[PDB]
Coordinates of C-alpha atoms (C1' of nucleotides) and ligand atoms in Angstrom, one line a residue:
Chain A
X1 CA -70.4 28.1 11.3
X2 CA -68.1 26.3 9.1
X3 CA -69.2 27.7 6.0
X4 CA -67.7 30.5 7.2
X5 CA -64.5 28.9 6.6
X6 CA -65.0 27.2 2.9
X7 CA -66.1 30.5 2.1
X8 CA -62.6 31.5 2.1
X9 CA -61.4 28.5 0.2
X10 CA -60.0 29.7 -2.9
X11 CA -61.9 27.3 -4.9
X12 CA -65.5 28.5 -3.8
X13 CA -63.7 32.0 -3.8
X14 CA -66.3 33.9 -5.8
X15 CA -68.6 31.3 -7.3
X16 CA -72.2 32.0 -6.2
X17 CA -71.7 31.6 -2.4
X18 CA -75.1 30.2 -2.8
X19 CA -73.9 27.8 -4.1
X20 CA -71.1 26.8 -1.8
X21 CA -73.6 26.5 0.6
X22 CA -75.4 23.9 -1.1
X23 CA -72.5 22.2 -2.1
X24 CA -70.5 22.2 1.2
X25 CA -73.3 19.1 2.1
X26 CA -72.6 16.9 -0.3
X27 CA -69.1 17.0 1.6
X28 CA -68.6 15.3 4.3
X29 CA -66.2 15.9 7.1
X30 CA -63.4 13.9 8.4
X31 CA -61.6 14.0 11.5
X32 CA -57.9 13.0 12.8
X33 CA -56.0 13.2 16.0
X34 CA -52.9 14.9 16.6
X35 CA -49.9 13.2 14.7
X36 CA -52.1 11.5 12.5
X37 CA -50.5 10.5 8.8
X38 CA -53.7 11.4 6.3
X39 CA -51.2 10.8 3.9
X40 CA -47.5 9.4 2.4
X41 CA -45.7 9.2 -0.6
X42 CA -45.5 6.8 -2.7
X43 CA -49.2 6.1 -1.9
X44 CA -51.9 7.2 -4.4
X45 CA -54.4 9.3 -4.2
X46 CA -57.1 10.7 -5.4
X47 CA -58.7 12.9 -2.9
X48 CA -57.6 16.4 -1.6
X49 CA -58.8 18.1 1.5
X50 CA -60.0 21.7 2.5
X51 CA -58.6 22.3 6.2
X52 CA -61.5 23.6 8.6
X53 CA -59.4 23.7 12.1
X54 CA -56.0 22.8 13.0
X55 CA -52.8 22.3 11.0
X56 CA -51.3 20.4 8.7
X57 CA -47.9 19.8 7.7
X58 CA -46.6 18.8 4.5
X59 CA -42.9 17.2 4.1
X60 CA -40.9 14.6 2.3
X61 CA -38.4 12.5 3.2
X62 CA -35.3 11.2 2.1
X63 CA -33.8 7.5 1.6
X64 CA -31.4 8.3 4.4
X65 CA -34.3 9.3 6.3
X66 CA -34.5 13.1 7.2
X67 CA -37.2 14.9 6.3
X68 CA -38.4 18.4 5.7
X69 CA -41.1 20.7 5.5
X70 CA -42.9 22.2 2.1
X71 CA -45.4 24.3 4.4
X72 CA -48.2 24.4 6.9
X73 CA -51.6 24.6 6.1
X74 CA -54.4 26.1 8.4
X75 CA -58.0 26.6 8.5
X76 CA -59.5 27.1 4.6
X77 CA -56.2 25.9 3.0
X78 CA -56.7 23.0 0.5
X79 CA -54.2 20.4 0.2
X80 CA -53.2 16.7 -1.9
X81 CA -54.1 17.9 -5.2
X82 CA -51.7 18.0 -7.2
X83 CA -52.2 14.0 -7.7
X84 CA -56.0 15.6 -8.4
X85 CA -53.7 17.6 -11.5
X86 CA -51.4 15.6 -12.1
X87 CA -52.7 12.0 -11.4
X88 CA -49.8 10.0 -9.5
X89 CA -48.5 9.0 -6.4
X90 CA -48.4 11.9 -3.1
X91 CA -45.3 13.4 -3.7
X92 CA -45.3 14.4 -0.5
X93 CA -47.0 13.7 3.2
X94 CA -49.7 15.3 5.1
X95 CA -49.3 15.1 9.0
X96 CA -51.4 16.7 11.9
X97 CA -49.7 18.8 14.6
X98 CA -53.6 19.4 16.1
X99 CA -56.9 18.1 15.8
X100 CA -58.1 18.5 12.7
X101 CA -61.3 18.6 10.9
X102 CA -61.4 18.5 7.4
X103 CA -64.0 18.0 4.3
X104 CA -62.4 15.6 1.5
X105 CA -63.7 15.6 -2.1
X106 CA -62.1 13.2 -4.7
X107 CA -61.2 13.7 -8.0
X108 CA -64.2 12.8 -9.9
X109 CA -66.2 14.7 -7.6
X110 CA -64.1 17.9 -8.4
X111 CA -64.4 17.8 -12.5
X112 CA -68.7 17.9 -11.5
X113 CA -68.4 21.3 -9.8
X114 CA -66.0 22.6 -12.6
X115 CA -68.2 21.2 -15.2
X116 CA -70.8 23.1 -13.5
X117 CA -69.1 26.3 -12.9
X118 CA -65.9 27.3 -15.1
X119 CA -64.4 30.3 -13.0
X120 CA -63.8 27.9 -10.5
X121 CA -61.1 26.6 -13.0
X122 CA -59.9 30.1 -13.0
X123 CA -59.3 30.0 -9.2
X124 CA -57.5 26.6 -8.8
X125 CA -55.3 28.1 -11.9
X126 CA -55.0 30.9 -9.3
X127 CA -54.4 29.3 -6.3
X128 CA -51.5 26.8 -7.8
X129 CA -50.1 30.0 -9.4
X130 CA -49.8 31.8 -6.5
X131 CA -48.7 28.8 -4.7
X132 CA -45.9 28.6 -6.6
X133 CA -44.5 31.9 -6.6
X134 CA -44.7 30.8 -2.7
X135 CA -42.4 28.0 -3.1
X136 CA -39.9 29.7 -5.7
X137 CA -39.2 32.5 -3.2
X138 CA -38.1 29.6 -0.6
X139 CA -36.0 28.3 -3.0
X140 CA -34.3 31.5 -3.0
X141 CA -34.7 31.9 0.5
X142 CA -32.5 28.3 0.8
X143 CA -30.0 29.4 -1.4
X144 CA -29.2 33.3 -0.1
X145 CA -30.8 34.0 3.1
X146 CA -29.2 32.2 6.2
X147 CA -30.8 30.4 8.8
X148 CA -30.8 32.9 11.1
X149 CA -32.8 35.5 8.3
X150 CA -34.8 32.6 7.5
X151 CA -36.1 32.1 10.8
X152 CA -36.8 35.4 11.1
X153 CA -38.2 34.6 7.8
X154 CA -40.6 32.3 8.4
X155 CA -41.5 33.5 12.1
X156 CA -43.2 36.5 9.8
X157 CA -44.9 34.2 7.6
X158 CA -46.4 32.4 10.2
X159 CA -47.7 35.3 12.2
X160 CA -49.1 36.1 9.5
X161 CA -51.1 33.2 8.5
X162 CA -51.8 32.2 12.2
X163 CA -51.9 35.7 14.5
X164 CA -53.6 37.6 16.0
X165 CA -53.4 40.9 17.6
X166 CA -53.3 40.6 21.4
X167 CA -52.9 43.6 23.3
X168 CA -49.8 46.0 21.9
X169 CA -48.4 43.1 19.5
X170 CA -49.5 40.0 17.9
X171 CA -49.4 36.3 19.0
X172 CA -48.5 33.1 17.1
X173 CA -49.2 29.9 18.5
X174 CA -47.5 27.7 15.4
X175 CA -47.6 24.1 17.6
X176 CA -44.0 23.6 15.6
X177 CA -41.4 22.1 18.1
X178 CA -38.1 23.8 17.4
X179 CA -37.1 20.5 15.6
X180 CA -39.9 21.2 12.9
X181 CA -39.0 24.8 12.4
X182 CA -35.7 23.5 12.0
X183 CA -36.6 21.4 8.8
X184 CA -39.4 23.6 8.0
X185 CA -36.4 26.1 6.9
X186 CA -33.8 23.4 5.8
X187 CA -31.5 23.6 9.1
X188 CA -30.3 21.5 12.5
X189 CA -32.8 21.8 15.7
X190 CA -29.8 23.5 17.4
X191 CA -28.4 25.8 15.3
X192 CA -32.2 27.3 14.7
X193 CA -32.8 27.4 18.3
X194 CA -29.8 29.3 18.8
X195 CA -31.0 32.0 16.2
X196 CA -34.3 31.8 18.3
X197 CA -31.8 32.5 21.7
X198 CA -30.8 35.5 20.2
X199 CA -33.6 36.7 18.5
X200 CA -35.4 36.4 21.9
X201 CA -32.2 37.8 23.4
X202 CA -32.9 41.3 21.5
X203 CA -36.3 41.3 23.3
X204 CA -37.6 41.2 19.4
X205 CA -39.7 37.9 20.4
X206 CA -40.6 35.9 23.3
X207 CA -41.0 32.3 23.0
X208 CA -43.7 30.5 25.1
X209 CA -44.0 26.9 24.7
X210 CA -45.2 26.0 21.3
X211 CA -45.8 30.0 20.2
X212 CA -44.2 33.2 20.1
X213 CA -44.9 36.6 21.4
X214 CA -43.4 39.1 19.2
X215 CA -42.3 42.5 19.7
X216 CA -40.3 44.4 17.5
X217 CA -41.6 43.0 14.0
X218 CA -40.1 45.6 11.9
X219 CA -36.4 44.6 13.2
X220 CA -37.1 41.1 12.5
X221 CA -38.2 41.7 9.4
X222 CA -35.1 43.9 9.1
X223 CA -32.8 40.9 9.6
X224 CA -34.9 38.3 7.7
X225 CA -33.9 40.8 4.7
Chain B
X1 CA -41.7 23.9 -38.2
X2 CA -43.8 26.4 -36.1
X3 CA -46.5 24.0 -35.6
X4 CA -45.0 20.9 -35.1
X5 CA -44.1 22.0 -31.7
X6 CA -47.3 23.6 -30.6
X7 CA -48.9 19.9 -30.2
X8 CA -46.1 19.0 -28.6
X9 CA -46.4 22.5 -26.6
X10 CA -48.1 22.5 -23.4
X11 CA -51.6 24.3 -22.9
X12 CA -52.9 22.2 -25.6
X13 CA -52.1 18.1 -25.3
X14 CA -54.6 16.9 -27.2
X15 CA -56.3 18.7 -28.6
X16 CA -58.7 19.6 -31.3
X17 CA -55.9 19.2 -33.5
X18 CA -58.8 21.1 -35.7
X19 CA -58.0 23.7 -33.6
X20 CA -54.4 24.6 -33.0
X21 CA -53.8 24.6 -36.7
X22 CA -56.1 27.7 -36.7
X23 CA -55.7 29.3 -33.1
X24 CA -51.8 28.7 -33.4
X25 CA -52.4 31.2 -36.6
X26 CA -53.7 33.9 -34.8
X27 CA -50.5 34.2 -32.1
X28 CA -47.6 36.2 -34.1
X29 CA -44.3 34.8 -33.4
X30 CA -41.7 37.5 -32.4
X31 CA -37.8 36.6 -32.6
X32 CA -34.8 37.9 -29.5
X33 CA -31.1 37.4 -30.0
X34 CA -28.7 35.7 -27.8
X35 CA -29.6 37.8 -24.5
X36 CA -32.4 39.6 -24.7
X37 CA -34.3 40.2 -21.6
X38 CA -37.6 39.4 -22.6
X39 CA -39.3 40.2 -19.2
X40 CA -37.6 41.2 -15.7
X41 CA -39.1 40.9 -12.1
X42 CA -41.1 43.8 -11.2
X43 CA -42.1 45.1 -14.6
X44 CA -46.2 43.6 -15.1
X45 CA -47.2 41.1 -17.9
X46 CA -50.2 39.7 -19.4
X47 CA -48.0 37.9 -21.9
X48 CA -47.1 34.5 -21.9
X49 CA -44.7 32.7 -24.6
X50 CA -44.0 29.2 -26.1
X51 CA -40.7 29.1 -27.2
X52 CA -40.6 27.5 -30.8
X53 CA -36.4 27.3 -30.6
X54 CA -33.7 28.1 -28.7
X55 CA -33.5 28.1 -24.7
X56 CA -34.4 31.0 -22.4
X57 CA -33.3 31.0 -18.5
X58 CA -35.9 32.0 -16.0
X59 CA -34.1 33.1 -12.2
X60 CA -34.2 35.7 -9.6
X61 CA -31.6 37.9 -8.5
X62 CA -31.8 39.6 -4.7
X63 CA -30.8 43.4 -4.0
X64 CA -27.2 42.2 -3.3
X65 CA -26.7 41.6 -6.7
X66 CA -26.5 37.4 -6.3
X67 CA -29.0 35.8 -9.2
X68 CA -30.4 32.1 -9.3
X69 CA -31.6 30.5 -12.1
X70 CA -35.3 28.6 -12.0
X71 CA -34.8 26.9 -14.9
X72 CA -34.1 26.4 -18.5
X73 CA -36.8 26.0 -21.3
X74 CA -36.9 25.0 -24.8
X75 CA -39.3 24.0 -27.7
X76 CA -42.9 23.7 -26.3
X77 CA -42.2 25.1 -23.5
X78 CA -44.5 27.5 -21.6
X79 CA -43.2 30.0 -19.5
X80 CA -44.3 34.3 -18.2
X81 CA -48.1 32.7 -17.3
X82 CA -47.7 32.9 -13.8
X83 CA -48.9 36.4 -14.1
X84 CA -51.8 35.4 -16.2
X85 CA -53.5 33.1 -13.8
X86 CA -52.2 34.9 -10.7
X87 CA -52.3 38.7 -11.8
X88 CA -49.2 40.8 -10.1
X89 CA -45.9 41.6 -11.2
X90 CA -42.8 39.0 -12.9
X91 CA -41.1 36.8 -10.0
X92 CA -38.8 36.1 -12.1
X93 CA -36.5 37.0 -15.5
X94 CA -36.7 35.8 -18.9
X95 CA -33.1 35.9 -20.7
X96 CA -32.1 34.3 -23.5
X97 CA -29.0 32.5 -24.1
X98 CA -30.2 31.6 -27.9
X99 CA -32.0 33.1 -30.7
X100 CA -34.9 32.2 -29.7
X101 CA -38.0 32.1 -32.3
X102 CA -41.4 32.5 -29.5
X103 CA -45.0 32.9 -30.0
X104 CA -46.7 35.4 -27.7
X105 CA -50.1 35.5 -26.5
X106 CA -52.1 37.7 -23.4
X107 CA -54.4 36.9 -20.9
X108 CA -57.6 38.3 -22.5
X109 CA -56.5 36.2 -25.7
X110 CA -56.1 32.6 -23.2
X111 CA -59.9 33.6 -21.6
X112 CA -61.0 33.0 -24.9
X113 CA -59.3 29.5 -26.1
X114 CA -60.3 28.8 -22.6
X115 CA -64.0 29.9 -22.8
X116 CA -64.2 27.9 -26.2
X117 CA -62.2 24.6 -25.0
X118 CA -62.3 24.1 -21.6
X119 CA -60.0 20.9 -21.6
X120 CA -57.4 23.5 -21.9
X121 CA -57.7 24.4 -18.2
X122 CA -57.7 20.5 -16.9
X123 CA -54.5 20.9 -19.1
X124 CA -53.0 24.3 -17.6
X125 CA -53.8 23.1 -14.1
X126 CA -51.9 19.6 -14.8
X127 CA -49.1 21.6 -16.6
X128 CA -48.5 24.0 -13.0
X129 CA -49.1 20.7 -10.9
X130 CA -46.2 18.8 -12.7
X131 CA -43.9 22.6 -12.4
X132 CA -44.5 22.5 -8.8
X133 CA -43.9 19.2 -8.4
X134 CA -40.4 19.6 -10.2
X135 CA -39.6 22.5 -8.0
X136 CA -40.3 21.1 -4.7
X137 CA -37.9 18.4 -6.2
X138 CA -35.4 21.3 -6.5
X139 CA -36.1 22.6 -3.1
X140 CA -35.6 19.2 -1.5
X141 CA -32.3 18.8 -3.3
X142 CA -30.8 22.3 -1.8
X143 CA -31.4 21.0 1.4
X144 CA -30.1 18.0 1.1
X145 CA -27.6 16.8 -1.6
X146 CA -24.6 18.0 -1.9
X147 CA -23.1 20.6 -4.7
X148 CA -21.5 18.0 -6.9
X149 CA -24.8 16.1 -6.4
X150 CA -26.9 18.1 -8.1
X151 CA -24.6 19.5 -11.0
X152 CA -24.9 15.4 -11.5
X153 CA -28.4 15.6 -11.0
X154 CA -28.7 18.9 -13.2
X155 CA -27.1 17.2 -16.1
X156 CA -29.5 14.8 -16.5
X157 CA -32.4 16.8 -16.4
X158 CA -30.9 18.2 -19.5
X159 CA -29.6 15.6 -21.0
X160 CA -33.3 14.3 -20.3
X161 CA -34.9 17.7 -22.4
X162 CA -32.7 19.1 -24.8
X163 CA -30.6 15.6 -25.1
X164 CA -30.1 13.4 -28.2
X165 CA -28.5 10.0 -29.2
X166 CA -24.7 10.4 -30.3
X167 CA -23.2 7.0 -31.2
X168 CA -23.4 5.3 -28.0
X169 CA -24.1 7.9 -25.5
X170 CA -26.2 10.7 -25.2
X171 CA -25.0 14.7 -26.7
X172 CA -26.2 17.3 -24.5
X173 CA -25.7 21.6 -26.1
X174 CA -26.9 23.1 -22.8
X175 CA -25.6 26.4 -24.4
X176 CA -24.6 27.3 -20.9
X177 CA -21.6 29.1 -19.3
X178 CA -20.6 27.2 -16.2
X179 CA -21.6 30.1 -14.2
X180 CA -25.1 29.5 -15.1
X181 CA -24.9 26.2 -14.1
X182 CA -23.5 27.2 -11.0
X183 CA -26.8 29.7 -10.2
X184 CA -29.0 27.1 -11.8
X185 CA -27.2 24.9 -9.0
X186 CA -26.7 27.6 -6.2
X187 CA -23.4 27.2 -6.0
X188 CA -20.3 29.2 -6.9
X189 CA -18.7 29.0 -10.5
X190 CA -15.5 27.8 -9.5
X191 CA -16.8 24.7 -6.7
X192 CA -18.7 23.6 -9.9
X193 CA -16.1 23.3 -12.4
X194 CA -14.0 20.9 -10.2
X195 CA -17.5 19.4 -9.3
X196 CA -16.9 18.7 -13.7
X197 CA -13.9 18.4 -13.4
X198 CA -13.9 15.0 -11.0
X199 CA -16.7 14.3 -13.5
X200 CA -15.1 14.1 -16.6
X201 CA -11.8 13.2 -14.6
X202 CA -13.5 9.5 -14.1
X203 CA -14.3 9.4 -17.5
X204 CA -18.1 10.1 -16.6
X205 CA -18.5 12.8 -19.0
X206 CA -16.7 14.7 -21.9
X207 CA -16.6 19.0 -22.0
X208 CA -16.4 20.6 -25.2
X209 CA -17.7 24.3 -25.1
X210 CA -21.2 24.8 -24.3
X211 CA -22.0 20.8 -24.2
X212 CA -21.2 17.5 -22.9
X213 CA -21.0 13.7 -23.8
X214 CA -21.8 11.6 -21.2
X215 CA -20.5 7.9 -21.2
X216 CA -21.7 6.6 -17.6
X217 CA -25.4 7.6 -17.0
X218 CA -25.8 5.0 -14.5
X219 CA -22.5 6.3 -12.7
X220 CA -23.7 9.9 -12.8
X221 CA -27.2 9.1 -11.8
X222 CA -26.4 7.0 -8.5
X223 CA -23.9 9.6 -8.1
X224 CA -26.5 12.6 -8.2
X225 CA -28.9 10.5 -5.6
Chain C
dA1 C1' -39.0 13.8 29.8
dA2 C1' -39.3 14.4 24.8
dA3 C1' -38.8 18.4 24.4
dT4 C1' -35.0 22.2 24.9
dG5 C1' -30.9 24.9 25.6
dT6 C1' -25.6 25.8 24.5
dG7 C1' -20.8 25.0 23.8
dA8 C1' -16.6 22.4 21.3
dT9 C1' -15.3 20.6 16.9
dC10 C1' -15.4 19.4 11.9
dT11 C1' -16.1 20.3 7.1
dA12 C1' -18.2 21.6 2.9
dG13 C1' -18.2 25.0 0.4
dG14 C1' -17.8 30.1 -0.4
dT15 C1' -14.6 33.8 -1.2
dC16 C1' -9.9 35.0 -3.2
dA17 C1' -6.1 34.9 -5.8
dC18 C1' -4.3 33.8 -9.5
dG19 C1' -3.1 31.0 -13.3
dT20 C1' -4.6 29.1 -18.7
dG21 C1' -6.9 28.5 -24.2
Chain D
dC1 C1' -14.4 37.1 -20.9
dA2 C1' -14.7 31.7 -20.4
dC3 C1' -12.4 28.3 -17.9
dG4 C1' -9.2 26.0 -14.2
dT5 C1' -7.4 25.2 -9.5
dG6 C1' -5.5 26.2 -5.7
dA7 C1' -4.8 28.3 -0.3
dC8 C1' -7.5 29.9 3.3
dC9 C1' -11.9 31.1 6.3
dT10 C1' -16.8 31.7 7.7
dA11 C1' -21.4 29.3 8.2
dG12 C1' -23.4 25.6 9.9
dA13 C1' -24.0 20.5 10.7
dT14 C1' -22.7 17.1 14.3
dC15 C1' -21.8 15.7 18.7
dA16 C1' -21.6 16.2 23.5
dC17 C1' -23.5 17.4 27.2
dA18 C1' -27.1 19.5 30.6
dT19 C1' -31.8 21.4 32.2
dC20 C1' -37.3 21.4 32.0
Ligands
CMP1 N1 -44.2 22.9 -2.2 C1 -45.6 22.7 -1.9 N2 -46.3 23.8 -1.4 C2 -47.5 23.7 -1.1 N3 -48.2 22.5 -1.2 C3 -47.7 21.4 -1.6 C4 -46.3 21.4 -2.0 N4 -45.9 20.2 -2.4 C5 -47.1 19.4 -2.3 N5 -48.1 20.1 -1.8 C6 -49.5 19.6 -1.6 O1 -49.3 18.3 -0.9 C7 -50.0 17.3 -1.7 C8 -49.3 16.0 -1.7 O2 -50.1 15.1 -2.5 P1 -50.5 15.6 -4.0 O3 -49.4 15.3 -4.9 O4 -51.8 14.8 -4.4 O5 -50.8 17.1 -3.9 C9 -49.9 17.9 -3.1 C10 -50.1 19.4 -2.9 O6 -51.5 19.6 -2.8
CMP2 N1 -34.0 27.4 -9.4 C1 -32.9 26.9 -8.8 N2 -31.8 27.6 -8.4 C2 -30.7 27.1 -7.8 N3 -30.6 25.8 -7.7 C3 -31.5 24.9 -8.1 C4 -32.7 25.4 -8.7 N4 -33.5 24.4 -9.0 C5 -32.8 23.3 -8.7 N5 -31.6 23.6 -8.1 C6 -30.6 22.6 -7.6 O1 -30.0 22.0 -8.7 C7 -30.2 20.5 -8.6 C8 -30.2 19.8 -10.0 O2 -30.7 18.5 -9.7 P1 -32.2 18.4 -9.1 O3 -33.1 19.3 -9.9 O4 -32.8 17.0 -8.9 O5 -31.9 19.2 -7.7 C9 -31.6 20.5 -8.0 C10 -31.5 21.5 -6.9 O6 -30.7 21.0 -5.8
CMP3 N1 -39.8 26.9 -10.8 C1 -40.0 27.2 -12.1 N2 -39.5 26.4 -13.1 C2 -39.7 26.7 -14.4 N3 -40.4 27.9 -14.8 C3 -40.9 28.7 -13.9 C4 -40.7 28.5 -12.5 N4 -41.2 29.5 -11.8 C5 -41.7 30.3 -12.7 N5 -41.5 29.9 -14.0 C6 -41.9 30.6 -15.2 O1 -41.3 31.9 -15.2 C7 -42.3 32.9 -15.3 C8 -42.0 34.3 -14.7 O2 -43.1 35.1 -15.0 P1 -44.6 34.7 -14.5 O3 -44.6 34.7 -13.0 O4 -45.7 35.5 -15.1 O5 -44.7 33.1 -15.1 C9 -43.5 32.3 -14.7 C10 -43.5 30.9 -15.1 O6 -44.0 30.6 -16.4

DNA sequence: AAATGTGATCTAGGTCACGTG
DNA sequence: CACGTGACCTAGATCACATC
């Protein structure tokens, strides 16, 4: 049902499914509406969150006020805790672009199932290090790859995470408007949409509201390069 | 002299102090000169390294023949264990711009300390949490200030690490050529030099070689935000 | 009816070219 | 082989609209 989700969290991953079961029920769920803040920096916390439908974004903000985006989480991906790590204030924000529904565990909570089980340990070590490596190759990404390849970029990344295989070619229905893309990659609405013009202009993609058909993958990839 | 630092070193705060003393025996220290690749993307590792001295760069370079640089550690610092938790390949280069005296240890070695002590894993996990935090720092800072911005903003994260107390102001040996600066910055040599140039032109900072004396923190600081 | 398209400018900064100790 | 500092020249933000 929705075990079938948790399952796939990275921190059960392994771990005497058995006991995920049991433990899911201790949890309890939480749900927000589309556009809801569960968190912001600056404010502390001491809770993270496993995803069990919808999407999530996380960003920061500047002073001057313009934000961007670190990533979007999905179904089974955990989020705010690295202040469960590294105690502190959110470092960054956690908005909804859906409905969501979501089990929260707190900090104190966590250190009883790793007391418990130790290879769970292993697996958050796991998850942060791959997560990571996720973020350094965006740095890169920012500093070589222009928007255009970056789009493409993350177009890929998304389908990914979020497709599925309709007829001939898969579907991605990311619920980004352009101007989230846009900061999800580090660039202007406009000048994002126009690499979405053209990328759509090729035939390679075609857009659809909040989603994206996509046809020639392997050319998109190509250019993302 | 090579165990001071290991309590100051990262997986162990704390701990045991019983402990290091005797585990910190058991690593062999290995020695590189002023260059040496220790590890390059692509090529595995199970090996991770506390640097005792000296300063080694980690960065990435794409197929065009462009490089970044991640970062640049020193004594205590941790670094190649990203492949230890997350099994897979380097991300990233280790160079050396020092002689650098580093103790080595492998992944079947850390299961152990681990398995003994597990307070080294709430440790490790707060150690990635705080490196991810200070990258998605970085990332924001791409994206958002500009060159001369962060070469200000750069300078005091060294000055911050590998700084000391000189008189009245604060002595910084980055042991860096301005082109690493620049790739630690992801900009070009030469648009970071004048960045220095205006720097030291207001009297913010002084050059000599491989280092720099900084009179106006609080100048460079509001500067770099 | 906020989400989009798309052009007409402006500019930071990259690329060159070439100096210097 | 590290720095320095110019004289251009592309990528892309910014603005200015117009369409659903
Ligand atoms: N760059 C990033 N990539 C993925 N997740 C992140 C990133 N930055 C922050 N997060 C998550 O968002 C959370 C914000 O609050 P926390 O600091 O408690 O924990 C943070 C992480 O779980
Ligand atoms: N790995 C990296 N490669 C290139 N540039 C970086 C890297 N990390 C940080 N930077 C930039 O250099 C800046 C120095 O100041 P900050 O770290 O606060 O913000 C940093 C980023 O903008
Ligand atoms: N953003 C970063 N800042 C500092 N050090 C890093 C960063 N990313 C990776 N490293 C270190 O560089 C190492 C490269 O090899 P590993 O992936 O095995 O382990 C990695 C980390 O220890």
């Amino acid at each position: 049902h929705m075990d079938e989700i948790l399952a796939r969290a990275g921190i059960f991953q392994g771990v005497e499914p058995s006991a995920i079961a049991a433990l899911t029920k201790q949890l309890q769920p939480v749900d927000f509406p589309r556009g809801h803040t569960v968190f912001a920096e600056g404010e502390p916390g001491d809770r993270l969150y496993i995803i069990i439908s919808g999407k999530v974004k996380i960003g920061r903000r500047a002073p001057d006020g313009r934000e961007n985006l670190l990533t979007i989480m999905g179904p089974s991906d955990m989020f705010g805790e690295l202040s469960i790590f590294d105690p502190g204030p959110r470092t960054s924000s956690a908005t909804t672009i859906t409905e969501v529904r979501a089990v929260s565990m707190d900090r104190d909570a966590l250190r009883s199932w790793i007391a418990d089980r130790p290879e769970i340990s292993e697996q958050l070590l796991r998850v942060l290090a791959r997560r990571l490596r996720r973020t350094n190759n965006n740095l890169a990404d920012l500093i070589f790859t222009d928007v255009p390849g970056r789009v493409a970029k993350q177009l890929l990344q998304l389908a990914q995470r979020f497709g599925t295989q309709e007829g001939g070619a898969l579907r991605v229905t990311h619920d980004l408007t352009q101007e989230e893309i846009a900061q999800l990659v580090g660039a202007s609405r406009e000048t994002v949409n126009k690499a979405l013009a053209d990328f759509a202009h090729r035939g390679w993609i075609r857009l659809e509201g909040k989603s994206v058909l996509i046809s020639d993958s392997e050319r998109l990839a190509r250019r993302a390069r």
